[PDB]
Structure formats: structure tokens, C-alpha cells
Design a protein around this ligand. Structure first.
Ligand SMILES: [Mg+2]
Lengths: 5, 306
């Protein structure tokens, strides 16, 4: 999955 | 393409004497959910209040609700197109939502709205996984770094830029430089963490995330990212526990009823459900569909508090 800034 | 903010109907701050001060006290107490309701109340009562919209926007990002964050920051920007913290937050939330063009435009507005840097706009100025504005942003930011190398926020902006082009090893160097210059900034720690995770370094990301949580123990977005890291490491039970914690704290027992929270909470529940399927625990899946925290608090030993 993508991690959020 | 919504431009009207969907206000939470369940908001006791609408009859508080001093909601803005309450919101800032709630931020200081590390309670994002409560702080956002308070800023929402301010935005309803004083719709031209730039700071209330900006704080609502940054608080919703921190509470893992980029969609609401963007709407709130878009209001702030309408009222004050020179608000540089607004541009910085929009660049971040746009990057997360894969709006690459809006993220580029926000990075430019961020730099050029600064008296320190505005002259760079007058300067007369592929092999990258980005559009062509991306080279311009590079030139502008590197020119700024040349005249002012120890501005941490220049490094953080390059970090955002390098995320947009899936250059995560570079971004990590940028964010490392930014936390070196400003080590008490929880947001920067989170950005370094997300960057490392996105660059397939979840073990390093978890280190960064623990730093951010030390600074802001209510940083729901960091807790979401922790679940992501564990998940990418195939540590499903640990991911399920972390996402449960994220969910519990995102609500904070404020008991939201609005459409806004309805959609913004769903992505956390989606991650829980995927983790449950990878744990071979399909018996918990329906509770995940109804967004019922109770069985997960029990299951993961979080009955006490998140
Ligand atoms: Mg109520």
C-alpha cells in the first residue's frame, strides 16, 4: 500500500 | 468535484463560547478529532476566518482525511492566496491523492508566495516520471536552496517533489535534511517515514513514525502509516492492531454522523478488512463492513483505549 505524507 | 465543506452535524462546539481557542487547546492535548470539530464550528460561525479554515485543513490531514483537508484548505486559499502554510498543506494532500498537477501547482505557489523567494518567479525558467512543470519546480527549488540552504522547508518541498516522481531514495535524503534542521517537527518525521515505506524500507519508516508519535501521540495519520508498513511486511496481525488504533483515535468517541466522516473513515476500515482477509479471519469481515470497533478492540487487546 501507499504511505501518506 | 465538491467545493462545499460537508460540516459534521454532531458538533457541540457550535454552542461553545470560544471554539477557536478550544481547537488550539485540543491540538495541544493531541486530540485531532476534537480539534477538527472545534475548527469546523469556527468555520461555520466565521466563514472568512482564514486561520480556522487552514487549521481545519491541517487537522483533517493529521486525522487521515485528505478529502476534507483539501476542501478546507481550498477555502483558506480562496480567502488568502498568499497563505504559505495553506500551499504547503495542499501540496502534501494532493501528492497523497495522486493529483500530480495540483501538487506541482501548490509547490510553485508555496515558493513564490514567499517574499524571500518571490524574485525566483522572474527568472527565465522526459528522463523523469513526471510532467514538464516538474523540471521547472526542480530549478526553482534548487535555486532557492542555493541562496538559502538551511531552510528546512525547502528540503521538505524537494521531498514532496521527489515523492511525486517516485524518487523515494532522494525524497528520503530531503526529509532527513529537513528533520536534521528541525527535529521537533512531527509532520516532517511522518513525511520521512512515508517516504521510506514508499521506497520499500518499512523498518526504517517505523523508526521515523515512532519519532512522530513521540511528538504528537494523537497523530492518526502516523498510526495509519504504521499499519501500512506492517502490512507491507506481511505482519498482518500487527497491522490489524495498528489500524484498529488509528480508527479508534480518529473517532475519538466524537461519534460523527456526517457524510464527510462516512466517506473519510471508510479507507481505514478498507485497510482493516484487507488485513483480516490476509489473516484468514473472514469471520471478522462483516463487523469491518458495519464499521463496528467493539470486536476489534476486544480482538487486539485495545479495550482500555485505542
Ligand atoms: Mg452531539
Amino acid at each position: 500500500y501507499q504511505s501518506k505524507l | 468535484m465538491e467545493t462545499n465543506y460537508p460540516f459534521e452535524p454532531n458538533n457541540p462546539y457550535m454552542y461553545h463560547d470560544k471554539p477557536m481557542e478550544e481547537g488550539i487547546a485540543m491540538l495541544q492535548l493531541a486530540n485531532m478529532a476534537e480539534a477538527a470539530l472545534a475548527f469546523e464550528a469556527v468555520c461555520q460561525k466565521e466563514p472568512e476566518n482564514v486561520e480556522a479554515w487552514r487549521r481545519l485543513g491541517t487537522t483533517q490531514a493529521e486525522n487521515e482525511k485528505d478529502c476534507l483537508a483539501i476542501i478546507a484548505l481550498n477555502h483558506a486559499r480562496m480567502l488568502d492566496p498568499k497563505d504559505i502554510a495553506v500551499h504547503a498543506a495542499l501540496a502534501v494532500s494532493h501528492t497523497n491523492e495522486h493529483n500530480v498537477g495540483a501538487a506541482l501547482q501548490s509547490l510553485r505557489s508555496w515558493l513564490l508566495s514567499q517574499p524571500q523567494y518571490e524574485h525566483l518567479g522572474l527568472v527565465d525558467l522526459y528522463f523523469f516520471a513526471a510532467p514538464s512543470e516538474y523540471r521547472d519546480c526542480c530549478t526553482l527549488l534548487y535555486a532557492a536552496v542555493e541562496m538559502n540552504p538551511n531552510d528546512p522547508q525547502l528540503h521538505a518541498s524537494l521531498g514532496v517533489l521527489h515523492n511525486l516522481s517516485h524518487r523515494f531514495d532522494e525524497a528520503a535524503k530531503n526529509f532527513r535534511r529537513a528533520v536534521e534542521l528541525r527535529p521537533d517537527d512531527a509532520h516532517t518525521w511522518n513525511k520521512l517515514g512515508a517516504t521510506l515505506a514508499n521506497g520499500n524500507r518499512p523498518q526504517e519508516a517505523l523508526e521515523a513514525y515512532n519519532r512522530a508519535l513521540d511528538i504528537n501521540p494523537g497523530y492518526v495519520r502516523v498510526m495509519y502509516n504504521m499499519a501500512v508498513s506492517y502490512s507491507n511486511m506481511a505482519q498482518y496481525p500487527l497491522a490489524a492492531k495498528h489500524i484498529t488504533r488509528a480508527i479508534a483515535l480518529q473517532a475519538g468517541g466524537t461519534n460523527p454522523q456526517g457524510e464527510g466522516s462516512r466517506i473519510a473513515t471508510r479507507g481505514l476500515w478498507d485497510l482493516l478488512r484487507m488485513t483480516l482477509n490476509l489473516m484468514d479471519r473472514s469471520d471478522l469481515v462483516e463487523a469491518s463492513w458495519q464499521q463496528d470497533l467493539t470486536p476489534f478492540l476486544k480482538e487486539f487487546g485495545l479495550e482500555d483505549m485505542a
